[PDB]
Amino acid sequence: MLTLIQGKKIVNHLRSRLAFEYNGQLIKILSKNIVAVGSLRREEKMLNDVDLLIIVPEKKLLKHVLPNIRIKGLSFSVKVCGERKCVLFIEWEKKTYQLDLFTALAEEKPYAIFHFTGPVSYLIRIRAALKKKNYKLNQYGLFKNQTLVPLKITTEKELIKELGFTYRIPKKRL
């Protein structure tokens, strides 16, 4: 049970302590590919769990990075690991901290993290304003009507700005 402040420090250390195993060598993940989700992204007071979104560049790497991801400096434990989502408990500073790692393609990296935090009430309202124009968004990109229509989205803000929706601060996502 760590606070938003403690986890903020946590992500800082994690930012330089997360890498994948490809070709026998440890490939570190650029700090530019790290986004916060859930309450941690909504500057919430306390957070029960810390959901981190990893950006997988290559296609195969998506199912390569998650399964071959080692941690240096911190103690981790894998309990429920899959392909796109992995559950592992890591202990740091002689204490245990819950850390859930989930990967998303470069296309859903901005969209998924944004639609990660939500919550449901915030997500449902989001679609309402977009529905007026016939646009949808979620770990995949911007959809038109009911089919994935390719939209240009870079970084993260582009996903919302592109839809022409009123951009709101992460803390204002309720």
Is 46 assigned to a binding site? no
Round to whole Å and give the CA distance between 122 and 104. Answer: 21
Q: Is 151 annotated as a binding residue?
A: no
Give the distance, in angstroms, between the CA of residue 39 and the centroid of all CA atoms in the same chain. 12
Architecture per CATH, domain 106-174, reads as 2-Layer Sandwich (3.30)
- Please state how this structure was obtained: NMR
Q: 44, 124 in Cβ contact below 8 A?
A: no
CB–CB of 9/16 below 8 Å?
no
Return the domain boundaries, the chain: 1-105, 106-174
For the chain, strand residue ranges (E) read 2-3, 18-22, 25-28, 34-36, 46-47, 50-56, 69-71, 75-81, 85-91, 96-105, 135-138, 141-144, 147-148
| Pairing assessment for the beta strands 25-28 and 96-105 based on DSSP bridges | unpaired
Ligand-binding site membership of 148 (annotated):
no
Strands 25-28 and 34-36: unpaired
DSSP 113-164: HHHHH--HHHHHHHHHHHHTTTEEEETTEEEETTEE------TTHHHHHHHT
Angle at 97 between CA 76 and CA 169, to 5 degrees: 120
Of 56, 74, 57, 44, whose CA–CA distance to 170 is shortest?
Answer: 44
Arch. (CATH architecture) of 1-105: 2-Layer Sandwich (3.30)
Cα–Cα distance, 168 to 20 (Å, whole number): 34
Q: Is the dihedral of CA 94, 95, 96, 97 positive or negative?
A: negative
CA gap 118, 129 in Å, rounded:
15
Q: Which of 114, 163, 110 is CA-nearest to residue 136? A: 163
Q: Please report where in the chains the tokens 């989205």 appear, as a residue.
A: 153
Peptide bond into 119 cis (omega under 30): yes
Which tokens sit at 46?
A: 């306390």
Residues 6+ apart with CB under 8 A from 134: 144, 145
Q: Is 24 exposed, middle or buried (0-12, 13-18, 19+ CB in 10 A)?
A: exposed
